Amino acid sequence: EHVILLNAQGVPTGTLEKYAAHTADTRLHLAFSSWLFNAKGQLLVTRRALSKKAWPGVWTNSVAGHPQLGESNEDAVIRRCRYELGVEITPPESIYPDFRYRATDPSGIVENEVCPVFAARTTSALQINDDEVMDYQWCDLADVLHGIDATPWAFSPWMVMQATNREARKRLSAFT
């Protein structure tokens, strides 16, 4: 996996190997974030494995990743969902297209990205890739939003920032 570097505008200028791109001085690159719900409306919350270089062992929204060069945002979502969760999903829907952020993890690892957010429904059972996901929980969106509002530090920075955006939160609720 590589990450796409972006300049002032979201114009791709080059690529870097994924692992090598995330350091204490991570440069701006493209990513995606996705919230998955099942047919019952429950939200899938996952805990990043201890082997993840950035934010290992952290509870976060369903799946996040980096689109590859030439790959559309939607297909990147499909690819990482199958890879980390072994699940098939409905067509990804945009919920927060202009989300951008920069955050530093406990180890000093930084994430600096233009990160559009999507939502989708799972159409198959989960088949966990323990190399990427160490735990997960199917919950009610309402309880997660309450958790995020009360103790945001207990979750990943991007999950918190995405869920606290008034418009994003409204669109997410439309999935329950």
Positions that interact with Mn ion (CB under 5 A) = 31, 111
d(CA 24, CA 107): 9
CB 171 within 8 A of CB 115: no
Whether residue 80 contacts residue 72, with contact meaning beta carbons closer than 8 Å, is answered with no
Cα–Cα distance measured from residue 37 to residue 120, given in angstroms and rounded to the nearest whole number: 6
Measured in degrees and rounded to the nearest 5, phi and psi for residue 24 equal -80, -10
Q: Between 33 and 42, name the residue whose CB sits nearer to Mn ion.
A: 33
Residue among 110, 115, 62 at smallest CA distance from 84: 62
Least distance in angstroms from the C-beta of 121 to Mn ion: 25
Nearer to Mn ion, 126 or 159 (CB): 159
Listed by the residue before each break, gaps in the chain with C–N over 2.5 Å are none
Which of 3, 89 has the CB closer to Mn ion? 3
Nearer to Mn ion among residue 77 and residue 141 (C-beta):
77
Q: Which is nearer to Mn ion, 19 or 137 (CB)?
A: 19
Least distance (Å) between residue 160 CB and Mn ion = 16
Interatomic CA distance for residues 70 and 15, integer angstroms: 12
CB of 132 to Mn ion, least distance (A): 14
Whole-number minimum distance, CB 111 to Mn ion, in Å? 5
Residue 113 CB, nearest approach to Mn ion (Å) = 5
